[PDB]
Amino acid sequence: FLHIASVKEDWGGDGRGRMNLSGRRTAIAKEYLPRQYQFFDTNTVMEKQGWRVRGMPDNIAPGSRRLLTWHDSGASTSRVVLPPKFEAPSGIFTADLEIFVIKGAIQLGEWQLNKHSYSFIPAGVRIGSWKVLGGEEAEILWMENGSVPLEYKYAQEDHPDARLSDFIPALDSKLLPWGKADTVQFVQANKKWLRKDINGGGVWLLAILPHFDNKYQMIQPYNEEGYCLTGYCDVGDYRIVKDHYWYCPSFSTLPRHITDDGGLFFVRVDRDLSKVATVLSYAPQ
Amino acid sequence: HIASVKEDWGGDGRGRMNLSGRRTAIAKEYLPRQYQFFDTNTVMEKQGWRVRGMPDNIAPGSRRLLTWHDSGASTSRVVLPPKFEAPSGIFTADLEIFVIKGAIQLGEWQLNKHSYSFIPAGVRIGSWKVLGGEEAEILWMENGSVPLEYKYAQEDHPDARLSDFIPALDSKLLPWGKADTVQFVQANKKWLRKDINGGGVWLLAILPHFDNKYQMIQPYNEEGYCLTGYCDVGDYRIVKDHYWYCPSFSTLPRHITDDGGLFFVRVDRDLSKVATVLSYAPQD
Amino acid sequence: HIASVKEDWGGDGRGRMNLSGRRTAIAKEYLPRQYQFFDTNTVMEKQGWRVRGMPDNIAPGSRRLLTWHDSGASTSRVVLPPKFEAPSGIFTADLEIFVIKGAIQLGEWQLNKHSYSFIPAGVRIGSWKVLGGEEAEILWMENGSVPLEYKYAQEDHPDARLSDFIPALDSKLLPWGKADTVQFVQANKKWLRKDINGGGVWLLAILPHFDNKYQMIQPYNEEGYCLTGYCDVGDYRIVKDHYWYCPSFSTLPRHITDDGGLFFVRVDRDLSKVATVLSYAPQD
Amino acid sequence: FLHIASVKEDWGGDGRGRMNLSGRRTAIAKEYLPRQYQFFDTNTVMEKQGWRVRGMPDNIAPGSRRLLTWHDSGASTSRVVLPPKFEAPSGIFTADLEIFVIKGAIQLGEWQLNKHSYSFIPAGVRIGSWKVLGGEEAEILWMENGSVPLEYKYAQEDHPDARLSDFIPALDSKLLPWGKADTVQFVQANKKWLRKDINGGGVWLLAILPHFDNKYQMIQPYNEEGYCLTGYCDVGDYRIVKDHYWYCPSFSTLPRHITDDGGLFFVRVDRDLSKVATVLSYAPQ
Amino acid sequence: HIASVKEDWGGDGRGRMNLSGRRTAIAKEYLPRQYQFFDTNTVMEKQGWRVRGMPDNIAPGSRRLLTWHDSGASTSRVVLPPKFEAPSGIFTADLEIFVIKGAIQLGEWQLNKHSYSFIPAGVRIGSWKVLGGEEAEILWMENGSVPLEYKYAQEDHPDARLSDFIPALDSKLLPWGKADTVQFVQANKKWLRKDINGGGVWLLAILPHFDNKYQMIQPYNEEGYCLTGYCDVGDYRIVKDHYWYCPSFSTLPRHITDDGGLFFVRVDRDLSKVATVLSYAPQD
Amino acid sequence: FLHIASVKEDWGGDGRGRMNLSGRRTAIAKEYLPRQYQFFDTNTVMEKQGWRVRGMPDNIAPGSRRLLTWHDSGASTSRVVLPPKFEAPSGIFTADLEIFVIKGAIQLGEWQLNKHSYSFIPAGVRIGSWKVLGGEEAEILWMENGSVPLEYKYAQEDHPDARLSDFIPALDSKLLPWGKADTVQFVQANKKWLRKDINGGGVWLLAILPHFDNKYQMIQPYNEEGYCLTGYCDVGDYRIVKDHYWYCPSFSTLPRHITDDGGLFFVRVDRDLSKVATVLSYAPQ
Amino acid sequence: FLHIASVKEDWGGDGRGRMNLSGRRTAIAKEYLPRQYQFFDTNTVMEKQGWRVRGMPDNIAPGSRRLLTWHDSGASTSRVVLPPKFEAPSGIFTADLEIFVIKGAIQLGEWQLNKHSYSFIPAGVRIGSWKVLGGEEAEILWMENGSVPLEYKYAQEDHPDARLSDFIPALDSKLLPWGKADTVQFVQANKKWLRKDINGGGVWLLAILPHFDNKYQMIQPYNEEGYCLTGYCDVGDYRIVKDHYWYCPSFSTLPRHITDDGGLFFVRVDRDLSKVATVLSYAPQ
């Protein structure tokens, strides 16, 4: 029970990743645009106030939500803002949930999640009472991944069938050290792995050093999304700066990347890019 | 081989350690996600201890029960007397032995100071006894699904996992190698046994002037015994003969030691994977 | 996807290359364990070549059939004319393309000199054409169980292995890396594609003053095309536009080249394993 | 068909290795001696003349055989001597066969196998006509491994079910380069892998450098056999020199190894020794 | 070449940088062993600046004098106007140039954003000018024993250290490499110039989430300019266009930055040696 | 001026090291014993109270001193104890001075030197006012190295000819990371370099891991001294524990080293041990 | 005696290299062109027949010479062709001489120098009788480096002051293995060192792999010359192919290098390029 209906991945994966980044509609497009990279400022995305997780008690304080990308099955990525006195009860969620703190601080059960802290809450895993810390609002990348739309349910203990192994209660990325990047094109950059799928896909922070230039375009046979946390990166004639987000479905052709200042980026990819012919440099004449 | 229980953190139970959900010597019940430290010297030493099934005439030992589970699994500090002498046979559960003091002999092999042995359930052991005319102290670890019992047998049980049999491993002769986790880079490790799931047993050598800097969220079960030196973990000082038990998702305080130390450690999860040991440092 | 034949040397057929048991352009039948080298310039160029199923009005190309199997699988040197222009659709068999001369465009992607593409059977390709107003020469590799045929389709076949799709790989932009085999240490390799069984396609750069010293027993199928430079293999000199086919267990002579060269190579077995490339040097 | 009855391994393996080194009787012992290392000079083992492979045409020239170790199921290791004009027809064998040339030269089909050349012929794989080269006798380590006793059968092509992947027609170990040793105790030595099982066990040449001293005894939870090709190695109070052979069944306790001269040794082991606690150094007081 | 002064910390003066004993823009005198940080935007920009010896008709620039010594040595932020155009010749002192904004051209070579040049005293430079019709901002570094002056010359001075001449180094094209010091392991370095004594000039890239943890006793002279991002050092936040000067034996506070940054750094001592950068963390 | 009379080193060095470890008399021996290792407990060495550095104002609080080793030229090593309210003025010293804190904390000028902090003060380099911190006594390894006996002299600035490059004002060894050891015999140990001579000799902390056994004796063609800070190390039938010190002049033959617990040791050597034949393993029959 | 007048190097070297590549006139230019790269086909350079080394007996068979570059002091580089029956006596030369075989084979004393064989004969070192082998002419890069013009002199033994250490009698580059390149721009290439100066300058073979593109121009603050042995390399709009030669004096600005086929090149440089800022990538807008 609980775990059911995991959809296969756009590029040819087996759906074990449970990310559901395939076939999504962006905030700036009326429908899913296949093989088309899309970049936009999340500041200009409309912020629907009074947002509340389905199933949550109605007396709970509401947050706001900027819906970045989503699929009709339920999966989505969004920039939520929880107010100063936000306080929610313990329980579970009906879908896999990823959380990444952009501004402020939050507390999930006994653990604090300050600036750039991360958590992966598998569907069925119980979380204690959670709240916003420091008397200031908190901004978070709220990522609902399950096959069904995410919903809160009160529970005393974990769901029997919960993939408890995959539970990352709190990971302060700031304390984690920088390591070598995976792809051949991003050699002059560093990576911080936050989570890795059973299929090799995952979540990580990418630090691009100054004077960066990947030189060619890139055919990306996989789904990728990301959020810019600091600095910038020119990709073609578009300049991605702080708070800009992107979505590149399978087989998108990304333009040349250039940045004299460098930057920090939250990235999420549903395929193992260590294999041969997974990131193809392209430069037509 | 029947009834192997799944692991706290979400493992498949193939490890057969059963470190999940245990009650300590100092606690009335299992305290989830709570690290517990204590001096084994102060744990009560019940005299007249004897393995269930052994012949009554065998000399008894003493036992200090550190941690245990109602299914049978347990960790203990036993003391076998100078003239201890037992017959050959098998045990109905996986058994791990680590010599703290003195020397013992299992079948044809001697196990002196810091010698180790893993006896899978069903594997036959020859006659065993205490050596040198002085008592021997051992970390006695009963792991199987059922409570451990002795049974006389001339040969091994047909279905015994004989591949996992480590008759005698003298850790002193083994060389020090690189540590696994990112936080314990200024330390060395000596692997004694590794599960099919990557969990295992090892000796940890913490070099002097050590400071891990942050707290650690540990999504796995771990226990250990301090053999030499010390290690401050929060406001508690772990020294020789102190033991610990950290069930899944415990939040271990900062570790500091100016002298360093040697530690017997046992963990039921592979810590090479991403997000398995999470450094934590909250503000106010 | 049905009928994938097992491989000569003992593989399970998952590679889907079908390099086993092929007849060369210069031989009346399959010659087992016999290396064969020949100049593709001298192979007959049949004009009016067209993919079965394509609309009749499409401009025809020419074809020099290098090696083939009766099941359908084949390797060829085709020449598409300046105004070649084909419609979108799928192909009923796995197709590999490597540009020798000129430039082509598959859908939205250009494939200029030494650009590569792997089109799994059932994967839809957009309209394609020759670029720059000059003809294009290509290594056309039909691999599937059945003979390759064009079929018009608006979307991909439901069961198409879309994961294996390499739309466009410009090998010129890719960097040189270490070679796999022990004998070709003084050479570099550029992987273009790797099978689920470890077999694959790659470019081999042999540095000048090369000498492998011994003969080589090759327990696997291999084919290749020389793009630049040369390589003496025994008393035969492989130069630009020469091709080879070595079925399983061929005994390749010594390789020597003072100038070095660039070579397109395709092998249906993982050569990282022990005893996969055996150096041989008999006495008298 | 063909492949049937592969026995499990003494120490707890799954029998996929197909070596059958478990439970063997030596030339110097009346029965299988469990957990007991045994060393002996193959020169003194009795050489039964008129040896011939079962099923071979009777007109074929006979060889001699010194039976080193064997099991009643059929598996064995022996030192055979083929005469100058030896010549046999093409065909298959009903069991896996390993060949290692000690002296002289032989030719299997089209390939020569001179001094220290090796071949692994899986059961069912066809070999062409074979003969002794150079007009002098050849000495070979003849290793019959299959579940049933080895027997010759005439065949035009390979047996349909033959594990043709595992076929090593001819490997001249002399041309192969020396590499790092696997175990922690044999760091001051080099290794030449000739064949590796699907289980990690295998065949290799071990080069022990001069001034060698492993320091302690070794508990070996696996089956191992070997033949000394050159030099020597004192193991306890026994000195292994050229033409000496050994057999160490699972859980044998090998004494300290010392050699001031070093040596070359043909070794065969049915377990992967890369894993933790596979070679246990022992030094009792 | 005469009068090269010895270095503060005990060097032999071969480096010829003269970073020792300098007065900052914000201090009335040289403050020994005291780190000083300040915003160059707020330093007074004296208009009508011109190199002593240059023809009077040449267009003037502006100058913000950061640090200097009475012997002549200095570091400054100069601004050359759109139409700036100077004649060829030599300079009586070692001169280092690093482009902050815009582009300049020295002789035949362009020096665009972050381009660098080291002109040893006596080396002839061709005519030079500002490019692109917009002003150029440069870190102008006069190093010689005597105050820098222009002199017209058709050829190089006979005794000029021509080996040390770095006409044009575009740092953007240079790749990032490993850092030298143990404290800045989570950072990369781009060497622009190295002294015969191991001191030098380089660009430092500090990755995000950086924290050096302790204070640093620096037994050497160092200066630097922030090009991008930020770095908190104690309670001061160094951001774009902020400069620093740390004379020998300064005690630098802890460095923290969540964003990271790019920094022009210049040091007159080899920091590869033991006990050259000393981590310091006092208690109470 | 200032720098004059640097004596050559026992084993054949050029005296540039300026350590003067050659030809010293120990606390337990009436004269210099050539090529003889000597070990002793510093606790039992007599503690002469009322110790004061020559030239220091007489009103300054006195310390105590346990003279470990010395040479008649002036060079020495000793365990001094400064009282709680100890406070000395700024100035220079006429000889090179090394300081290593064993217990408590001291402050030299503006810099604190807590437990295991180190400082190298070259002759002629000015130090500011210095005192004992924390209201508890401090214990220090006081090492006078110069050719002439060490003496305090008041000065406002550094001596013109002072080797100011060699000045290590304060090095907290605790903050320094462990690195690989230099010698072949101490592979299972780590090292922390505190200072390195122009000749390659130096000062460092040695961390010996548990279960250590160097196996053989060691012919040491160089001068070495050291102090045990924690743990132990059996060297022959003598057991070196906390507060024990040693002195091994050139060409001493050190017995086998064994320790089941491991330990931390302050070591000082006047020769580069990276060169061939500098530490000779010896094991006579 | 013998060694005198070694001129300093263009870029600021101390002249210890003794190469004298500074300030040379090319075959295609009327005078030395400072900081100007020059490329040309040696086939089109005029071949003066009847060439003979000054001091050689007049009865000796003459060769031909294509003078590539030279300086008035005596130093030069040239393509000489020795006929089939060429045979010269033993003796010395008054200047350093480098020899590299392009076609055919020659024999210097007892040693053969076949295709791509190299020799460095320091001034004053005696060479035995030398001749052309195989009955076909031999082509050689004849490099006279000494301060005075090269001249033959008969001698029975070596000149007393001859730098005999630097004597490389015969180096068959074909037998030498490929190693890593030195400069940052030529990472996708391999190098074969033939000789290295006391100053770090030297001679080597450069193997450029196919699909090469250095991307930017290069400011070269040093003297360099070279000859193309096989393949090609486009440098700007000039294509260097087999038998083309180049000369780049100090501070030349070399255009972008591109080659789809790769090639082999004989190169000679008078400066150590391992140091920082020795090869400066340049790309103006």
Task: Specify whether the CB–CB gap between E86 and E118 falls below 8 A.
Answer: no
| b/e per residue C223-258 (b: at least 16 CB within 10 A) | bbbbbbbbbbbeeeebebbbbbbbbbbbbbbebbbb
Task: Specify whether the CB–CB gap between F92 and F155 falls below 8 A.
Answer: yes
Structure tokens at F115: 């437990």
State the distance between the two ends of chain D, measured CA to CA, in whole angstroms. 54
Give C 146-165 residues with CB within 8 A of chain A: 161-165
In angstroms, the CA F102 to CA F79 distance is 9
- Name the 3-class secondary structure at C12: coil
Q: F211–B258: do the CB atoms touch at under 8 Å?
A: no
Q: B283–A172: do the CB atoms touch at under 8 Å?
A: no
* Backbone angles phi and psi of F89, in degrees to 5: -80, 170
Q: B283–A120: do the CB atoms touch at under 8 Å?
A: no
Task: Specify whether the CB–CB gap between C114 and C133 falls below 8 A.
Answer: no
Q: Element (H or E) spanning F163, and its range?
A: none
In angstroms, the CA C67 to CA B237 distance is 75
Task: Specify whether the CB–CB gap between E194 and E265 falls below 8 A.
Answer: no
The residue count of chain G comes to: 285
Q: Flag whether E touches D (3+ CB pairs, 8 A cutoff).
A: no
Q: A284–C191: do the CB atoms touch at under 8 Å?
A: no
Q: Element (H or E) spanning G232, and its range?
A: strand G224-235
Q: G277–E167: do the CB atoms touch at under 8 Å?
A: no
Q: Say if C80 falls within a structural domain.
A: yes
In angstroms, the CA F185 to CA F118 distance is 27
Structure tokens at A230: 């600091």
Q: Which of C80, C88, C83 is nearest to C48 (CA)?
A: C80
How many distinct structural domains can be found in chain C? Answer: 1
- Name the 3-class secondary structure at G166: helix
Alpha carbon distances (Å) from D101 to D83, D98, D138, D142, E140: 14, 10, 7, 9, 77
Alpha carbon D170 to chain centroid distance? 15
Alpha carbon distances (Å) from C275 to C216, D40, F71: 11, 31, 68
B275 CB near a chain A CB, below 8 Å? yes
Q: D167–C219: do the CB atoms touch at under 8 Å?
A: yes
Measure the CA angle with vertex D240, ends D236 and D245; round to 5°: 115
Q: E173–G285: do the CB atoms touch at under 8 Å?
A: no
Q: A282–C173: do the CB atoms touch at under 8 Å?
A: yes
A276 CB near a chain C CB, below 8 Å? yes
Task: Specify whether the CB–CB gap between G118 and G57 falls below 8 A.
Answer: no
| b/e per residue E124-151 (b: at least 16 CB within 10 A) | bbeebebbeeebbbbbbbbbbbeebbbe
Alpha carbon distances (Å) from C54 to B56, B191, C91, F176: 90, 64, 10, 73
Q: Which of E204, E271, E220 is nearest to E19 (CA)?
A: E220
Can you give the C-alpha Rg of chain B in angstroms? 18
In angstroms, the CA D259 to CA D239 distance is 9
DSSP state of B6: P
Structure tokens at D207: 């080069």
Q: Amino acid identity, residue F17?
A: G
In angstroms, the CA B5 to CA E280 distance is 51
Q: Say if D217 falls within a structural domain.
A: yes
In angstroms, the CA B196 to CA B202 distance is 15
Beta bridge partners of G118: G100, G171
Give F 165-194 residues with CB within 8 A of chain B: 173-178, 188, 190
Burial of F225 (0-12, 13-18, 19+ CB in 10 A): buried
Q: Which residues of F touch E251 (CB under 8 A)?
A: 110-111
Structure tokens at C80: 């598409």
Kindly give, in sequence order, each residue whose CB lies less than 8 Å from that of residue C253, ignoring residues fewer than 6 positions away.
Answer: C35, C215, C233, C234, C235
In angstroms, the CA B111 to CA B118 distance is 12
Kindly give, in sequence order, each residue whose CB lies less than 8 Å from that of residue B136, ignoring residues fewer than 6 positions away.
Answer: B79, B80, B84, B99, B101, B102, B103, B104, B130
Structure tokens at G218: 């290069």
State the distance between the two ends of chain F, measured CA to CA, in whole angstroms. 54
In angstroms, the CA F95 to CA F82 distance is 20
Can you give the C-alpha Rg of chain A in angstroms? 18
Q: Which of F172, F174, F192, F274 to mutate to test the interface with E (most CBs of E within 10 A)?
A: F172
In angstroms, the CA A50 to CA A65 distance is 8
Q: Which of B93, B96, B84 is nearest to B149 (CA)?
A: B93
Neighbours of chain E (3+ CB pairs under 8 A): A, F, G
Cβ neighbours of B114 (radius 10 Å): 24
Task: Specify whether the CB–CB gap between G120 and G72 falls below 8 A.
Answer: no
Q: C165–A284: do the CB atoms touch at under 8 Å?
A: no
Q: Smallest Cβ distance to B207: which of F175, F178, F229?
A: F178
Burial of C133 (0-12, 13-18, 19+ CB in 10 A): exposed
Q: Amino acid identity, residue G96?
A: D
Q: Say if C1 falls within a structural domain.
A: no
Q: Which residues of B touch D281 (CB under 8 A)?
A: 170, 173-174
In angstroms, the CA A33 to CA A31 distance is 6
Q: Smallest Cβ distance to B274: which of A169, A177, A195?
A: A195
Q: Which of F83, F72, F227 is nearest to F141 (CA)?
A: F227
Give the distance from residue E246's alpha carbon to the nearest chain F alpha carbon, in angstroms: 16
In angstroms, the CA A267 to CA A204 distance is 5
In angstroms, the CA B89 to CA F180 distance is 47
In angstroms, the CA F215 to CA F217 distance is 7
- Name the 3-class secondary structure at G173: helix
- Name the 3-class secondary structure at B101: strand
Sign of CA dihedral B231, B234, B236, B242: negative
State the distance between the two ends of chain B, measured CA to CA, in whole angstroms. 51
Q: Amino acid identity, residue C160?
A: A
Beta strands in B121-199, from DSSP E residues, in sequence order:
128-130, 136-142, 150-151, 166-170, 177-178, 187-194
Q: Smallest Cβ distance to B275: which of A114, A177, A194?
A: A194
- Name the 3-class secondary structure at C24: strand
Q: Smallest Cβ distance to B10: which of A120, A165, A202?
A: A165
Neighbours of chain A (3+ CB pairs under 8 A): B, C, E
Q: Which of B20, B182, B274 to mutate to test the interface with A (most CBs of A within 10 A)?
A: B274
Measure the CA angle with vertex D68, ends D66 and D71; round to 5°: 120
Q: D277–B161: do the CB atoms touch at under 8 Å?
A: no
The owner of tokens 């250095």 is: G214
| Chain D: residue whose CA lies nearest to B102 | D285
Structure tokens at E215: 């204070």
Neighbours of chain C (3+ CB pairs under 8 A): A, D, G
Q: B175–F188: do the CB atoms touch at under 8 Å?
A: yes
In angstroms, the CA E174 to CA E190 distance is 7
Task: Specify whether the CB–CB gap between E117 and E97 falls below 8 A.
Answer: yes
F49 CB near a chain E CB, below 8 Å? no
Alpha carbon distances (Å) from C145 to C13, C66, C73, C90: 10, 18, 7, 15
Task: Specify whether the CB–CB gap between E284 and E35 falls below 8 A.
Answer: no
Structure tokens at D241: 């020199």
Q: Flag whether C touches F (3+ CB pairs, 8 A cutoff).
A: no
Task: Specify whether the CB–CB gap between C276 and D167 falls below 8 A.
Answer: no
Structure tokens at F215: 């196996």
The owner of tokens 């090796």 is: D118
Alpha carbon distances (Å) from G90 to G83, G109, G139, G156, G192: 18, 8, 20, 8, 30
In angstroms, the CA E53 to CA G117 distance is 57
Specify the long-range contacts of residues G65-70, CB closer than 8 Å, at least 24 apart.
Answer: G65/G142, G66/G27, G66/G42, G67/G27, G68/G26, G68/G27, G68/G42, G68/G225, G68/G245, G68/G247, G69/G24, G69/G25, G69/G26, G69/G27, G69/G225, G69/G247, G70/G24, G70/G25
Alpha carbon A178 to chain centroid distance? 19
- Name the 3-class secondary structure at B107: coil
F105 CB near a chain B CB, below 8 Å? no
Q: F164–E251: do the CB atoms touch at under 8 Å?
A: no
A198 CB near a chain B CB, below 8 Å? no
In angstroms, the CA C88 to CA D129 distance is 55
* Strand pairing report for E187-194 and E177-178: antiparallel
In angstroms, the CA F241 to CA F40 distance is 10
Structure tokens at A190: 């560093």
Kindly give, in sequence order, each residue whose CB lies less than 8 Å from that of residue A38, ignoring residues fewer than 6 positions away.
Answer: A26, A28, A29, A246, A247, A248
Q: Element (H or E) spanning G47, and its range?
A: none
Q: E9–F165: do the CB atoms touch at under 8 Å?
A: yes
* Strand pairing report for C136-142 and C150-151: unpaired
Burial of E82 (0-12, 13-18, 19+ CB in 10 A): middle
Give B 208-267 residues with CB within 8 A of chain D: none
Q: Say if C222 falls within a structural domain.
A: yes
Task: Specify whether the CB–CB gap between G118 and G98 falls below 8 A.
Answer: yes
What is the DSSP track for D99-136?
EEEEESEEEETTEEE-TTEEEEE-TT--B--EEEETTS
What is the DSSP track for B21-37?
TPEETT-SS--TT--EE
Q: Which of D78, D83, D76 is nearest to D42 (CA)?
A: D78
Cβ neighbours of B80 (radius 10 Å): 23
For chain G, the maximum distance between any two Cα atoms, rounded to a whole number of angstroms, is: 63
* Strand pairing report for E177-178 and B261-267: unpaired
Q: Say if F151 falls within a structural domain.
A: yes
Beta bridge partners of E117: E97
Q: Which of B34, B5, B35 is nearest to B17 (CA)?
A: B5
| b/e per residue E186-219 (b: at least 16 CB within 10 A) | bbbbbbbbbbebbbbbbbbbbbbbbebebbbbbb
In angstroms, the CA A64 to CA B265 distance is 47
- Name the 3-class secondary structure at E40: helix
| b/e per residue B177-206 (b: at least 16 CB within 10 A) | eebbbebbebbbbbbbbbbebbbbbbbbbb
Q: Say if D192 falls within a structural domain.
A: yes
Q: Say if A3 falls within a structural domain.
A: no
In angstroms, the CA E138 to CA E77 distance is 6
What is the DSSP track for D230-280?
EEEEEETTEEEETTEEEEE-TTEEE--EEESS-EEEEEEESS-TTSTTSSE
- Name the 3-class secondary structure at E95: strand
The owner of tokens 């290295």 is: G196
Q: What is the CATH number of the domain that holds D58?
A: 2.60.120.10
Cβ neighbours of A16 (radius 10 Å): 13
Alpha carbon distances (Å) from C205 to C168, C191, C199, C245, D38: 21, 11, 18, 19, 52
Beta strands in E45-156, from DSSP E residues, in sequence order:
46-49, 61-68, 74-80, 85-86, 90-91, 95-101, 104-106, 109-111, 115-119, 128-130, 136-142, 150-151
Q: G12–E103: do the CB atoms touch at under 8 Å?
A: no
For chain F, the maximum distance between any two Cα atoms, rounded to a whole number of angstroms, is: 63
Q: Which of D203, D244, D6 is nearest to D120 (CA)?
A: D203
Cβ neighbours of C132 (radius 10 Å): 14
Q: Say if E123 falls within a structural domain.
A: yes
Q: Which residues of A touch B273 (CB under 8 A)?
A: 196
Task: Specify whether the CB–CB gap between F79 and F65 falls below 8 A.
Answer: yes
Q: C219–D194: do the CB atoms touch at under 8 Å?
A: no
The owner of tokens 């160089």 is: F222
Cβ neighbours of E66 (radius 10 Å): 24
Number of inter-chain CB pairs under 8 A, A vs C:
58
In angstroms, the CA C115 to CA C192 distance is 10
In angstroms, the CA A86 to CA G141 distance is 83
Q: G264–C208: do the CB atoms touch at under 8 Å?
A: yes
Alpha carbon distances (Å) from G159 to D191, E114, G90, G167: 51, 55, 13, 13
Structure tokens at G71: 């300086």
D202 CB near a chain B CB, below 8 Å? no
Range of the domain at D131: 8-285
In angstroms, the CA A281 to CA B5 distance is 49
Alpha carbon distances (Å) from A254 to A39, A260, E264: 11, 19, 32
C103 CB near a chain A CB, below 8 Å? yes
Q: Which of G18, G267, G15 is nearest to G163 (CA)?
A: G18
Cα-Cα-Cα-Cα torsion A43, A47, A53, A56, nearest 10 degrees, comes to: 130
Q: Amino acid identity, residue C170?
A: D
Cβ neighbours of D129 (radius 10 Å): 13
Resolution in A: 2.6
In angstroms, the CA B152 to CA A220 distance is 65
Q: Which of F240, F238, F237 is nearest to F208 (CA)?
A: F240
Q: Amino acid identity, residue F187?
A: V
Cβ neighbours of G58 (radius 10 Å): 6
Q: F188–B176: do the CB atoms touch at under 8 Å?
A: yes
Q: Amino acid identity, residue C114?
A: H
